UniProtKB/TrEMBL annotation, chain C:
The keyword Nucleus does not apply. Part of the 30S ribosomal subunit. Contacts protein S5. The interaction surface between S4 and S5 is involved in control of translational fidelity. The keyword Ribosomal protein applies. GO terms for cellular component: small ribosomal subunit. The lineage of its organism: Bacteria, Pseudomonadati, Pseudomonadota, Gammaproteobacteria, Enterobacterales. It holds the Pfam family S4. InterPro entries: Ribosomal_uS4, Ribosomal_uS4_bac-type, Ribosomal_uS4_CS, Ribosomal_uS4_N, S4_RNA-bd, S4_RNA-bd_sf. One of its GO terms (molecular function) is structural constituent of ribosome. NCBIfam families: PRK05327.1, rpsD_bact. Coiled coil: none annotated. Keywords: Ribonucleoprotein, Ribosomal protein, RNA-binding, rRNA-binding. This is Small ribosomal subunit protein uS4. GO terms for biological process: ribosomal small subunit biogenesis; translation. Protein S4 is also a translational repressor protein, it controls the translation of the alpha-operon (which codes for S13, S11, S4, RNA polymerase alpha subunit, and L17) by binding to its mRNA. One of the primary rRNA binding proteins, it binds directly to 16S rRNA where it nucleates assembly of the body of the 30S subunit.
Amino acid sequence: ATVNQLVRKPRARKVAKSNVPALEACPQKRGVCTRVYTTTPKKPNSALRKVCRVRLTNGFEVTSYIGGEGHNLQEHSVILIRGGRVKDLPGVRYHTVRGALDCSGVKDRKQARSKYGVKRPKA
Amino acid sequence: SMQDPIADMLTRIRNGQAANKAAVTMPSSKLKVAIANVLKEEGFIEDFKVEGDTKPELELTLKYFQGKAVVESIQRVSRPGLRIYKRKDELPKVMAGLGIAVVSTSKGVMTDRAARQAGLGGEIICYVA
Amino acid sequence: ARYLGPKLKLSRREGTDLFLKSGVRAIDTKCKIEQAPGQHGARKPRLSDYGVQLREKQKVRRIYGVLERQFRNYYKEAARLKGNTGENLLALLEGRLDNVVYRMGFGATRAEARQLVSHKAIMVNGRVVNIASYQVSPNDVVSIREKAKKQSRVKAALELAEQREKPTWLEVDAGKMEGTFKRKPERSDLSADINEHLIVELYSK
Amino acid sequence: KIRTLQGRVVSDKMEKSIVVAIERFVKHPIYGKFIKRTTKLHVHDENNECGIGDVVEIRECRPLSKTKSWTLVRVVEKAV
Amino acid sequence: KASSXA
Amino acid sequence: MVTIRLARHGAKKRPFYQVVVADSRNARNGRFIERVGFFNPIASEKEEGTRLDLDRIAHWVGQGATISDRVAALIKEVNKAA
Amino acid sequence: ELQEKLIAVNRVSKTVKGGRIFSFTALTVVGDGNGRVGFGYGKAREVPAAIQKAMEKARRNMINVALNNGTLQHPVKGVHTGSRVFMQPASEGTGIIAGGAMRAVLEVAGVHNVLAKAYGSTNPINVVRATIDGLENMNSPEMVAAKRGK
RNA sequence: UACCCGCAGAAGAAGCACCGGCUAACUCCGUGCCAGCAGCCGCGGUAAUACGGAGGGUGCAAGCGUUAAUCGGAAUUACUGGGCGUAAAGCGCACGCAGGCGGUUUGUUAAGUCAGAUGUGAAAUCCCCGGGCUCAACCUGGGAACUGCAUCUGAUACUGGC
RNA sequence: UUAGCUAGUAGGUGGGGUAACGGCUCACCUAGGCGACGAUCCCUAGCUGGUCUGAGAGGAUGACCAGCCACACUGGAACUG
């Protein structure tokens, strides 16, 4: 409102909160992967979404989504998580990178293989 | 409260021409006249009048044209709550120029367009459109 | 870093002739031009304010063989440049040596006008210019490489060349093969289905 | 002169330890309003002259005690 | 119109 | 020892020194007092190749100041008054 | 010099007994390219019928705006309901730089420049309104003589 | 080495994301609320341009995508530039210290304020006009700028003090 | 959701000291000194030129390059010059 007021208690910015805080605010992280489960999403949709509870490197343990039809993951493994949430499964704020570390890319995927990690099959 | 007599002029005037009247009066103040003069000279009001002796009274003859009045708008810039002063080049120009902006200088009041060429500068009383 | 593919497929999307398959019989046609830029060309593309705005430049690029990563900078350039940035971008787009080549008929297409400027077969006030991007100032005179002069190709080009609209800011020759940059192209002596602002905007958002 | 300065006391009690204050209109760097910003300078007082409240002239000079680098020059007015 | 909570 | 020398402000292979009055001790491109000309070891037979405020260099030498030996090769390879 | 194009087209409702009835509303603007601009709303149970009806009011009601070489003079700012809007002139810095919906009413009216920005609501219907009434009040420059010269 | 001249021959060199909307860009098949997509809305329960594949198309190119981070858009802390009857928002009300602000006229002060000048504000960077590497990046000449501070000589309407 | 902080502490005088002024040190003496324009206390952090973003005012940042500073196993000390 008033200048005098702004002069006194000055206007204060409101910091932002990284939707993904699996620390360092850094590209991706390595994690041991505690369990490999499958769950059900919100009311509108109904699948058997695949997920894994991963013990990151920085100590935070967190649940991550496994994108693509099928995966090699299980018990131990060592995926590397990324970012981007999964608006359908709450709590799932991270996606494990496919075809990274102990994670196998989606078998046979031919479209947009950059994700789901796969290599050009016989050009 | 009484704190500001200047924004009382601009307001009474902006309000007077609002209620399409021809004359508006208010107690007289030296600076007020200085401004009055400005508006006259610049053709924003037909003219002033000051028939005040013991209790100085000031009247302003309002102008008009077609389906509107002369002053499309008039705002107070520097106020007692936040004074504003400007250099020679920092002097503000109203409506790409089509409109004065009363600036008081150490050598008597003026108009933005005036003071500019004048070479000096000072506090800017208000904005008249 | 060049197109290298169905070039008509392009001019069919722009619905105009981009001076691509110039060569012998100028004035295109013969390929289905219009009614099928793809597998649904038949359709009526009722495009958005965006479409009739991206397609504008998506054209300008092609009507010269220039790319994005680089086109931008041209715009950024023109921007700093005083005056209608629209005509300016054009002024710089035309000012391209790969263009002054073709434009001076020293080569069929603006595509065939590269394979050489690239394969050192041209030059300026001396020094052979290897980069098909050189920016030709005023007076700057080119000259097909005194070396592989008039060959089993470039000759057949000048033919249709001088029988084309013909520029106005260059004083080409014919056997002496060596035009000049008389002056920078004004706005009045160049245009057609090309809008400035319509593109100067796309880069304002 | 070699840079003169006006200022008002702060205390009479101090024995050769006379401190002062300096007002200065200053335009806040963002909101533009004009703020009063003070500066307190400890000053040298030989034979402890000029009492409290008084207004005085000061000069920047050589150190004389842990943080005390100014000496009076002239006293102006004595009732405030 | 509205999902996951509304 | 305020020695007038050159700093390598060129670019891979294409240097470009710069005569400058500076406290002998500092780094090459380290703190200095005032550029006082330059030196272009390229240029190619055209217009320029070197510049020096000769009537300034003297002002320094005047307050005692040793000159580089590669800086001296410039103070004269370009004459003095002819 | 027709010069006419639509801005937006929304589908509304009228919830009755056996369900709801959807109508359609189109907002369109027209002008020439030298002052004079106008807009018209209009709705009809049919898509075209609406837009067709849109040009009708569009034709009628066309205020005369006082440009300058293809731009504006004193920079201006107009308001209507929830949208506050402002506009700066200058020699075609690029060519009509303003927001969608608020743009057309700038093209058709004939101003290949202006740097604009829409604040407040960005609902087409009220910004086109704000803008028009923004160009409107824009007083006479080369005819300042009104209150000017005197 | 940079560079210059031949030798040979298209030989030796293209990928990635995307196509329901925002957002440029379509279909078939499979599939069946399964499998899976998703940045937001939102797609899938038999004929789905939103899933996977194929065809096709679109946009970028030695890259393309994703994740991460900052500013922008966000007039979404609003000084420029926002608000509070019901949308989030006027202290339950009142007195009042500090502070903020203050009617009117003259004289004076000249601090604020203002104009000219002089120091200074490294260089580099950004910017303006040129130069040089084939161009450009890069390199470089000169200039403007560094919106600031201090000192002094003026100004006096307005503001402050007397 | 830190409001009070300080005895060499604040000043004086007087010896000693330093390259030099100086509480630097000591002795004596007045009793002060700083603080809500935010001291003190916590948490964080190398500072500037600039860098990124922005129409701008600003927001963010200070790797590479240059100026200033600081440290060089941790803590402490002097010596040489």
